[PDB]
Amino acid sequence: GLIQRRNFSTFASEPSVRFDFNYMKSVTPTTEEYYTYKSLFEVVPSTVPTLDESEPFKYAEIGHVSKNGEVFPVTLSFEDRDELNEDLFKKIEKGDIFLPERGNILISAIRPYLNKIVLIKEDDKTDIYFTKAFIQIKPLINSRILYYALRTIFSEKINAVSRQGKGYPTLKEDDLKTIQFSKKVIDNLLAKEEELISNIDALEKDIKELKSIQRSKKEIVDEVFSSHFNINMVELMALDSQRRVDVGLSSISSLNSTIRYSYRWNKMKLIQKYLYRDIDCIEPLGKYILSSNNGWSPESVVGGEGIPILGQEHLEFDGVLNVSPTKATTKTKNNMENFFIQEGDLFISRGNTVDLVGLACVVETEVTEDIIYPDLYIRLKIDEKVIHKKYLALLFNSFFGRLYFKYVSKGKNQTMVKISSNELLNYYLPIPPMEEQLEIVGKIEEQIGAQNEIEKQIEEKRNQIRVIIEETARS
Amino acid sequence: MKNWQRIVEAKLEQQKHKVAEISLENGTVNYSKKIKHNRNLKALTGDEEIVRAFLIDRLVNELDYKPEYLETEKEYTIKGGHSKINPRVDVLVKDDKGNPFFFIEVKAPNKFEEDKDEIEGQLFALAQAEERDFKTKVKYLVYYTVELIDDEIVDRAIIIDFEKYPTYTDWSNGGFISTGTELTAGYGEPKKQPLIKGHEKYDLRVRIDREEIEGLGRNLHNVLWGGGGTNDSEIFYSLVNIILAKIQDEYEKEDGQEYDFQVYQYGDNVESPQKLFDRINALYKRALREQLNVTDEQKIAEDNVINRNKFPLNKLVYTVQALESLSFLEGRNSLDGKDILGDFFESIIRDGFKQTKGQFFTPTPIVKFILYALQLDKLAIDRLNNDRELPLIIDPSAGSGTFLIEAMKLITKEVKYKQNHKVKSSRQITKRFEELFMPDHNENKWAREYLYGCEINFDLGTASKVNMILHGDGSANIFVQDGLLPFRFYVKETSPNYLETASPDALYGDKEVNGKFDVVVSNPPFSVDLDTQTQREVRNAFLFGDKKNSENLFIERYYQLLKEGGRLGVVLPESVFDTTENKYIRLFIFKYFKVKAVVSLPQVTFEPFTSTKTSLLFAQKKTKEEVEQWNELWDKYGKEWSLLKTRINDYFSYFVKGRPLNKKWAPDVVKDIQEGNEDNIRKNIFRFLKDHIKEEDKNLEIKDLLIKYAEEISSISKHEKETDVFGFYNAWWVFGEVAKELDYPIFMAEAENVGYKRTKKGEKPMPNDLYDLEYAPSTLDCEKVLSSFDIEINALEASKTKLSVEKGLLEEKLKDKEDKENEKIQKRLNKISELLETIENQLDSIRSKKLEVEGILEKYYENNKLKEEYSERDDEELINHFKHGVLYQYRSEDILLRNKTVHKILDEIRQGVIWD
Amino acid sequence: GRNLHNVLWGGGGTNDSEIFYSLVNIILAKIQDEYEKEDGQEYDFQVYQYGDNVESPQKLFDRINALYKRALREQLNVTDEQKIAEDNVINRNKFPLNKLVYTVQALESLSFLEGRNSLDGKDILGDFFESIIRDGFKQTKGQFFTPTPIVKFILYALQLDK
Amino acid sequence: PFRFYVKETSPNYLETASPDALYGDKEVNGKFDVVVSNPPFSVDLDTQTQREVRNAFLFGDKKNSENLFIERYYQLLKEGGRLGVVLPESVFDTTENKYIRLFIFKYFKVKAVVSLPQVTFEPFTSTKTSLLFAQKKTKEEVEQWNELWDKYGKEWSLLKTRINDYFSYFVKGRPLNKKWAPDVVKDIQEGNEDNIRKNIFRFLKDHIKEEDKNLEIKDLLIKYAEEISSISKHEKETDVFGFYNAWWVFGEVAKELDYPIFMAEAENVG
DNA sequence: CTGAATATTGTCGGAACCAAGTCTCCATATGGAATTAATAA
Ligand SMILES: Nc1ncnc2c1ncn2[C@@H]1O[C@H](CSCC[C@H](N)C(=O)O)[C@@H](O)[C@H]1O
Ligand SMILES: [Ca+2]
């Protein structure tokens, strides 16, 4: 670790004589400028707002804010008072709500390292409330200047005055009033104020433009299968809502081969009767599967030494392996070569939540390193003449592969719901001719490729802002 | 103003000698001039003055003490701190020699408990001052209050011989020494503690009140639990053992026979704690012979109430002191609030216990939903109406008896109170109803014969017994031994022991069957891993007693308990319904039972103890003829399957592989191979492949047809490795064929939320999908509610009138005063002016609320009932407004049983499901 | 430490604290048995079984309990004969003899003495207490035991040897 | 209490107890060389021992387990005994624990502080902890602390009145009273001079600012007015400290005696 | 009659945390893969 040495005196600093390792790591002897909280920002005391009980207002927790300072408020009304959001209304009535004064820079107290600093810009509308866990810190040297000086830089020191204290990492306003902000940062940043705000505004306008057309990685897979099989999107999520499935004794045996009479099995059978009313392409998967393996999941150490191992997090809704291993093992099995992925395989996911079970992926990346897949995967070697593995993975990640594996997979612990070879072999998927396939794929491929192309531009301008701030504050 | 104040005033007006009088109408008190008074007592300042007046009257009249010797409100200025405190004593009774004999301090009945700590400054110091400044002898220090008993009031007091304990420290070292309880006439009282020696003029207590019980629970939790060592459950089990000993000192105690559960304060010193320990362990050892009916005499020994190391003896002495004077059994005459000791031990469980993973109970909403889904109310009503009896519920695996306490509540409340209109008199049924429950003093006496829950844990067994007893029942028919044992192993002590008989059953492995229990409700453990020697002892009464899946045995056990048509409601895991390793136990349920309802409960029900998925299964039991019909169908279709498998494997041998015919495999198979007939072959293959056959393969020829369906043929031809109980016939083929002939609907449903969301911080309401509460009661005492509102508005009006008189007096004072005091006077006038305007606004608001109350009661309830237009409680306004305002106080927390509208799981499972 | 749980718990059954103070007494009796027996003698801490099937559990109780009362007279130094005569290894009402049989049969082969130098750095009873006892009970009492590496670091950083 | 420990063997070293003049006439066994333990963080004490700790411990009012046991260490150790314990991070960082922090600072001689990872105790509680490695001071080393504690506390008490009278006069207009002090009224009449500046810099020795050395008198009274009431509020439980505000006093106390102690952090325990 | 009481309310501090979200590593039968003695032949 570190062999830091300090001298009693030091712990004299700050009105709590504290001597935890982090604070004393942040102290250091200083020779340069000091400043204080005086010639900069100013803490604002909290207050109870006058909520109007006639219109839908907004509210914002700490989880509703992101590391990029983008609040995602929820809309409450005081005419609903539903027991699902009753906690929010109760904490509002308690007095855990305030309203920023259009120019302050709210800072989260709990765990301040996750950049929850947000800006309430001057020229704006649709006033949003906030939790007392946020610190109104309204500045005197222009909000944007202090916001950008706090987000990227002045972060190794706001995070070094947190109270660990047998639990939550937490920031306190009193400690926040003690940081030793250098002047060269603010001096240089205000010196270039007239153009820094301009080009940063241009960059964030481009980011907003990219975000305006950004689409989720699952809806794309959800729409093409919905727009190609001519199934309306507003009934299979409305038929899945009603829960009064009624079956007879005779229907239990039909295609069961294990006599399973759970409720979810019967609802799966009901939904299958709806997803295939007009589609005439369904063929049993059992006759298109040639083998099935599981994998090898030894004990693993995170960021250790040995052969890397994949996890369930590496399977995404696009049928492409993430191939970004984290765990690494050092055990042997005398047959390790049987589980070293290799390009071209199809990996369905066995073991996950009731909604993330069955997600398949094709290893489309060329890797010269041997990477083991766990017992939580199932490798499918299908005939590459009728199924087109990528299409099968996309189908498994589609609502076809969700409304089935959500209701057929087994286990008493529905937090680690697992599938088995029986459900794979007894799966009546719709397989259209090879002409129809490679059209759903390809369309989905280009749409997701475009969505990924505008996913690094966002984290290119969001990095350009940071590097520009760093360069200007260092010149 | 309590009722005992009225009784005291009536007794004072009834006294021949007018030595003490009170007036509640004027709030005044008067005493005879014979008593030397150091202060003018002419107003009733509170309950203390009334109690003091009654005490003085009792001393003069009943206790025969000279009023001249009595002294009231004598000043006893002492040196307290930097200044001189001026305390005053209430009552001083002096002997013929002038020395104070009784040093009585008067306190309110509620003040009699939390003000004991002030006794050090109220009794001992003042007595020391009396002895010092007057050279007199103080004999007895009395901390006294009134105690209502029948149409009379007696003295509930702690009396301390001041000579024995001149200091408060000596009093506290002996554990709150009390030489006497009730005042004795003619300078009496013994040195030894007056023993209870019940079954006479004196007893433990029969008129216990809610406030006393709440304070007892508070102080018991404060003292016993503490924070030092042991645990939070060990203390609970020790307290349960002590309560069991207390009940033992009510079952085996005849007339006279001084109670063994008390301090036995001989002389002036508390009897040695070891004597108390020994004479309580004797009670507890005698308790494990009729209460928990333990037969092994060596197990009776080497077993104690407390560890003596986890539970110090002083805590046991304090527990005895607190609980000695409270008759748990048979004492519930607080029936103005009905049963009062059940919620006491419910609060004991809730406040002190540490339910964790493996100790948690079954949530009450699920238990109530199960009991209602069985239609147990209608079952009990019809069981009592036709042939006078009740259902005879059993709950194996009943750790805390939640399925049995709730069953008691559900049967009593809905056979006497709610649905009593569905019980036909017909003379005999009235007599049986009177016998089962009616005196209102023992409403659960019927549950001494119809509740046969079991439990394997000794501690939880005793806790369930105490639960059962404190609710007005006897726990004789609850067994603290294993629930999976030969039926002869369950002996109670009494004659009716339904869970003892056994008999072989031809249709069930020639094994024991107790076909006597009406319904079975249970929550079996999710993972039973039996001992290597307990496993071997159970492979003689269960068909699948060797599958290493012991938790399924309970399901099989449920077949040995029901009575050919017995309702069965179980909280099973979803492995039973989903995983393949349990297929056998799914066939069993489909063979003997008549599966009728399946409900999928969320993964939040048993949180934060486990996120294990659960499903409620509601299955009946087939009669003796349905099982044999199933057996006949199974045998016939299995014979068909065997013939088809022989024909199909002969076909497969001839084709693909290729045989030059053979030695006449069978007459049928070798009659067309030479003749080339294919229709018979086609139909035979279709029958043997009744499931894996498509419509496009009809035209396909045999040679490749036997190749297309080749794995299926090699699989559907396999028999069951184990559970030959079926007879080598393939389960799937024969099961489908049987289900095709006999078929019944199976109601299935899902629950999104169960009302509650418990977590490691507390509970939290959620939208219940299982059931809806009544909110608006079917019956409401309208005159009681109107009188309560009239009383509160009259009290506020009296306060307004008093403050208006004060305002008039202050105005009169202001009219003839000068500025120097007029400043303060006008300050008072403005204070009272805004105070009275606020009171007027409050009165107007309460009047509006009252008017809305008459409006709603006349619109809905009418003559202290609820009109049938809203018996379904479908109207949002009524239930919403009852869940609001002052009507929230009365309310109603009862599961609504709708009959016409169905938007709930329970409301439709009680209508679509039909029980045979 | 893992399989001696859900067999002793037994799907509910014996409480987690009952398991703990029964196993500690069982291990005390085992240590006594290893301390008394001399070369050539058969151990009392074992179950005599005729291949399959075991002897009467009552005779196993009156061979391990006697070891326990003989254990807290020579090493625990308890001298009050009344306490010795009133104490027992386990409570049969809260710990069936079958679980005692399973515990002994699981611990028959292990040699706690002279085996303590092989599992160096493994506090047996502490780890058993942490595993068996639930987290709620440990939280309201601070029953969180400091691991062997950390305590070793503490005692070696104080220069306690010096 | 040390008299509650009984043992019928070789002299029970955990039974002696004599009052200590430096600890406030309270029992000190004080026979052992090392104490190693992990305190029961945040556990409610028994009522019987809850009654007996108020009159036996220097901080008996603060009903907190981890700290009403950092004293037990002081009682057990000798004049030079060694200590090492796994304390919580709350002792080292939480501000609601300024008392104990100073106890440890006065009686014990901190010599090494290592911060264990949060992966310690992971399957059970996973709370951040640290190690203290303290040693008790000798008797002739605690008399030094006190004599300093007061030498720098009397100055703080005088400065409290002097600067709070400067505040009352220079801002919030108030005429001279002539009973304030024989030096504040003797110097206000002449001018700010150096006496006002010296006495206002000494009181504000911590916050201060170098660039504030040259500016008008009515500037260094309003910017610091929010914290003039912070270093002039003194410290609760005066019985153990002495009616001072601590931080200031402490500040110099330490500055006159310096310990070059060792600190470290582990990220992987092993 | 000045008082700074105590006596509450209502609100900062702080938690051997722990509610949400979602990834796992390991026992254990099985079943098949090896025999076997069978099994006709
Ligand atoms: N034969 C047996 N085997 C294992 N546990 C049994 C058992 N018989 C009864 N039990 C006990 O029954 C309990 C079931 S958990 C259900 C608790 C209780 N029925 C309620 O509704 O609140 C377990 O704690 C277990 O200890
Ligand atoms: Ca365990």
Sign, CA torsion D207/D210/D214/D215: negative
Q: Are strands D112-115 and B504-505 parallel, antiparallel or unpaired?
A: unpaired
Chain D residues with CB under 8 Å of C141 CB are: 40, 43
Residues on chain A touching B587 (C-beta within 8 angstroms): 259
Query: ∠A388-A393-A397 over CA atoms, to 5°?
Result: 145
Handedness of CA A391, A397, A399, A401 (dihedral sign): positive
Distance CA(B279)–CA(B260), nearest Å, equals 7
Beta strands D77-88 and B152-161: pairing type? unpaired
Contact D26, D20 (CB under 8 A): yes
Supply the angle between the helices C16-36 and C57-71 in degrees, to the nearest 10: 70
Taking Cα atoms as reference points, which of B596, B584, B592 lies closest to residue B732? Answer: B584
B400 lines ligand 1 (CB under 6 A): yes
Alpha carbon dihedral B823, B828, B831, B832, in 10-degree steps, equals -140
Q: How far apart are CA B160 and CA B163, in angstroms?
A: 9
CB within 8 A of D240, min separation 6: which ones?
A: D24, D58, D59, D99
Q: Which two tokens stand for residue B368?
A: 């109530």
Helices (H), A162-240: 173-176, 183-191, 193-212, 219-228, 236-239
**Strand, coil or helix: A411:** coil
Minimum-distance CB partner of D45 among B222, B223, B228: B228
C146 is in an annotated binding site: yes
Rounded distance, CA B786 to CA A427, Å? 67
Instruction: Give the Cα separation of B559 and B512 in Å (integer).
Output: 10
3-class DSSP state for residue B346? Answer: helix
Beta strands B511-512; B504-505: pairing state:
antiparallel
Q: A331 near A298, Cβ under 8 Å?
A: yes
C79 annotated among ligand-binding-site residues = no
| Structure tokens, B146 | 């009134």
Separation between Cα atoms, residue C138 and residue B616, nearest integer Å: 34
Return all residues near B236 (Cβ < 8 A) that are at least 6 apart: B348, B349, B352, B353, B463
Q: Positive or negative CA dihedral for B44, B45, B47, B53?
A: negative
Out of A83, A256, A264, name the one closest to residue B766 (CB). Answer: A83
Dump the DSSP string for B4-60. HHHHHHHHHHH-SS-SEEEETTTTEEEE-TTSEESS---S--SHHHHHHHHHHHIII
DSSP class of residue D137 equals P
Question: From the CA of B315, how many Å to the nearest CA of chain D?
Answer: 12
Could you tell me the CA-to-CA distances from B199 to B256, B257, B688 in Å, in that order?
Answer: 6, 9, 80
CA nearest to B344, candidates B206, B467, B473: B467
Distance separating alpha carbons of residues B191 and B519, to the nearest angstrom: 58
- Nearby residues of A285 by Cβ (< 8 Å), 6 or more positions away: A424, A425, A426, A427, A428, A429
* Three-class HEC string of B484-531: CCCHHHCCCCCCCCCCCCCCEECCCCCEECCCCEEEEEECCCCCCCCC
Task: Yes or no: say if D33 and C160 are a contact pair by the CB < 8 Å rule.
Answer: no
Single-letter code of the amino acid located at D200: I
Nearest to A375 by CA among A292, A293, A289: A293
Interface residue A7 vs chain D (CB under 8 A): yes
Tell me which amino acid residue C3 is.
N
Cβ–Cβ under 8 Å, residues D257 and D144: yes
Q: Strand order in B614-621's β-sheet? A: A246-248, B745-750, B593-601, B614-621, B562-573, B517-522
Q: Which nucleotide is nearest to B547 (CA to C1')?
A: E29
Q: How many CA atoms lie within 13 A of B732 on its CB side?
A: 20
Contact B157, B248 (CB under 8 A): no
User: Is the separation of the CB atoms in C88 and B304 below 8 Å?
Assistant: no
Quote the crossing angle between the two packed helices C57-71 and C97-107, to the nearest 10°: 70
Backbone angles phi, psi at A62, to 5 degrees: -80, -30
Q: Select from B512, B559, B537, B544 the least CA-distant residue to B724.
A: B544
Asked whether A421 and A350 are in contact (CB, 8 A), the reply is no
Beta strands in B603-679 (DSSP E): 614-621
Q: Which D residues between 61 and 90 have a beta carbon under 7 A from any strand E atom? A: 86, 88, 90
- Which tokens hold the place of B24? 């509640």
Chosen for mutation from D92, D130, D204, D227 (greatest number of chain A CBs closer than 10 Å) is D92
The verdict on whether omega for the bond into residue B100 sits within 30 degrees of 0, i.e. cis, is: no
Interface B-D, measured as beta-carbon pairs within 8 A, has a size of 16
Q: Please name the residues in contact with A20: beta carbons below 8 A apart, sequence gap of 6 or more.
A: A164, D89, D92, D93, D115, D130
**How much is the CA Rg of chain B, to the nearest whole Å?**
38
d(CA B339, CA A169): 50
> Rounded distance, CA B306 to CA B293, Å?
20
Residues 6+ apart with CB under 8 A from C105: B532, C47
How many other CB atoms sit within 10 Å of the CB of residue A347? Answer: 25
Sort out which chain B residues have CB atoms less than 8 A from C102's CB and list them: 531-533
Distance CA A297, CA A308 (A): 11
CA A367/CA A344 separation, integer angstroms:
11
Neighbours of B323 (CB within 10 A): 20
CB contact under 8 A, D48 and B223: no
* Helical axes C97-107 vs C16-36, angle rounded to 10°: 50
Q: Tell me if B610 sits within 8 A of B357, measured CB to CB.
A: yes
**Position B136, amino acid:** T
Task: Please report how the helices B210-220 and B342-351 are oriented relative to each other, as an axis angle in degrees rounded to 10.
Answer: 30
Closest CA to B307 of C31, C63, C21: C21
Q: Please, are residues B796 and B836 in contact by the beta-carbon 8 Å criterion? A: no
* C146, C150, C153, C157: CA torsion to nearest 10: -60
Alpha helix ranges (H) inside A63-142 = 86-94
Which amino acid is it at C23? L
Give the tokens for residue A448: 């997701």
Give the integer Cα–Cα distance in Å for D156 and D49: 38
Beta strands in D129-245, from DSSP E residues, in sequence order: 129-131
- Maximum Cα–Cα distance for chain C, whole Å? 57
Give, in degrees to the nearest 5, the angle at Cα B163 between B162 and B168.
50
Question: What is the Cα–Cα distance from C64 to C58, expressed in whole angstroms?
Answer: 10
> What's the CA gap between C18 and C100, in Å, rounded?
12
Question: How many angstroms does the Cα of residue C43 sit away from the middle of ligand 1?
Answer: 37
> Residues near B421 by Cβ (< 8 Å), separated by ≥ 6?
none
Distance CA B163, CA B137 (A): 9
From C126's Cα to the closest Cα of chain D, the distance in A is 13
At C25, list the tokens.
Answer: 């007494």
Please tell me the distance from the alpha carbon of residue D255 to that of residue B707, in angstroms, as a whole number. Answer: 95
CB A387 within 8 Å of CB A346: no
Q: Per the structure block, which two tokens stand in for B195? A: 């023993």
C-alpha B735/C-alpha B107 separation (Å) is: 78
H/E stretch holding B337 reads none
- Which residues have CB under 8 Å from B412's CB, separation 6+? B437, B443, B444
Give the closest-approach CA distance of A178 to chain D in angstroms.
9
Q: How far apart are CA B157 and CA B194, in angstroms?
A: 12
Q: Find tokens 């309208």 and name the residue.
A: B782
A window 272-331: Cβ near strand E (< 7 A):
297-300, 309, 311-313, 326-327
HSE of D212 in the Cβ direction (CA atoms, 13 Å)? Answer: 22
Other CB atoms within a 10 A radius of the CB of residue B844 amount to 10
Could you give the C-alpha distances from C115 to B312, B349, C24, C111, in angstroms and in order?
38, 45, 17, 6
Give first-to-last CA distance, chain D, whole Å: 39
Tell me the two tokens of residue A114.
């996750």
Residues of B in contact with C54 (CB under 8 A): 533
* C-beta atoms surrounding C162 within 10 Å: 4
Rounded-to-integer distance, Cα C129 and Cα B381, Å: 52
Task: Give residue C142's region: left, alpha or beta (phi > 0; psi -120 to 50).
Answer: left
The closest residue, in CA terms, to atom 12 on ligand 1 is B397
Contact flag, residue A20 CB and nucleic strand E, below 7 A = no
Joined tokens for residue B493 = 């002590």
Q: Which residue has the tokens 């009595």?
A: B70
Structural contact between residues C134 and B233, judged by C-beta atoms closer than 8 angstroms = no
For residues D13 and C119, the answer to whether their CB atoms sit within 8 Å is no
**Closest chain B CA to residue C86:** B302
> Exposure of C135 by Cβ count < 10 A (0-12 exposed, 13-18 middle, 19+ buried)?
middle
Please identify residues in chain C, positions 101-140, with a C-beta within 7 angstroms of any atom of strand E. 135, 139
Cα distance from C141 to chain D (closest Cα, Å)?
A: 6
* Chain centre to alpha carbon of residue A253: 42
Cβ atoms of D118 and D165 within 8 Å: the answer is no
What are the Cα distances from residue B447, in Å, to A57, B386, B474, B478, B518? 56, 20, 7, 11, 14
| Overall resolution, Å | 3.1
Nucleotide nearest to B824 (CA to C1'): E1
Other Cβ atoms within 10 Å of C81 Cβ, number: 10
Q: Among partner residues C10, C88, C136, which is closest to B528 by beta-carbon distance?
A: C10
CB A380 within 8 A of CB A289: yes
DSSP E strand boundaries for A319-436? 327-329, 346-349, 360-362, 377-382, 428-430
DSSP, collapsed to helix, strand or coil, labels residue D127 as coil
The CA-based dihedral angle spanning residues B14, B20, B23, B26, taken in that order and rounded to the nearest 10 degrees = 160
For residue B247, what are its two tokens? 């009940």
The helix (H) or strand (E) run that includes residue B533 is none
B582/B562 Cα distance (integer angstroms)? 22
Q: What's the half-sphere exposure (Cβ side, CA atoms, 13 Å) at D211?
A: 5
Q: Give the whole-angstrom CA distance, residue A407 versus residue A239.
A: 14
Among B16, B13, B15, B14, CA closest to B24: B13
Tell me how far apart the terminal alpha carbons of chain A are, to the nearest angstrom. 33
Give dist(CA A48, CA A99) in Å, integer.
8
> Which ligand neighbours the alpha carbon of C130 most closely?
2
Structure tokens belonging to residue B461: 């067994």
Q: With beta carbons less than 8 A apart as the criterion, state whether B608 and B575 touch.
A: no
Here the tokens at position A380 are: 């499918």
Residue D172's Cβ-count burial label (10 Å; 0-12, 13-18, 19+) is exposed
- Residue B798's alpha-carbon distances to B5, B60, B794, B812, in angstroms, are 20, 36, 6, 21
What CA–CA distances, in Å, run from B645 to A223, B698, B716, B820?
A: 48, 20, 9, 118
Residues in chain D: 270
Q: How far is the CA of B726 from the C1' of E30 (A)?
A: 21
Helix (H, G, I), strand (E, B) or coil at D36: strand
Cβ atoms < 10 Å from Cβ of B489:
11
- Nearest residue by C-alpha to atom 14 in ligand 1: B397
Å between CA of A93 and C1' of E11: 14
Residue B423 and residue B415 in contact, taking contact as beta carbons nearer than 8 Å: yes
Instruction: Say whether residue B222 is in contact with chain D using an 8 A CB cutoff.
Output: yes
Report the SS3 class of residue B106.
strand
Determine the Cα–Cα distance for residues A272 and A406; give it in Å rounded to an integer: 12
What residues have CB less than 8 Å from B431, skipping those under 6 apart? B388
Q: Crossing angle, helix B376-386 and helix B364-373, to 10 degrees? A: 50
Tokens of residue D236, six digits? 């609760």
Return the partners of chain B (3 or more C-beta pairs < 8 Å).
Answer: A, C, D
Q: What token pair was written down for A216?
A: 């989720």
Distance between CA atoms of residues B680 and B395, nearest Å: 55
Nearest to B317 by CA among B248, B271, B250, B285: B271
Interface partners of A (3+ CB pairs, < 8 Å)?
B, D
Q: Annotated binding residue at B357?
A: yes
DSSP letters, D46-66, are PHHHHHHHTTTSTTTTS--TT
Closest among B206, B196, B161 to B179, alpha carbons compared? B161
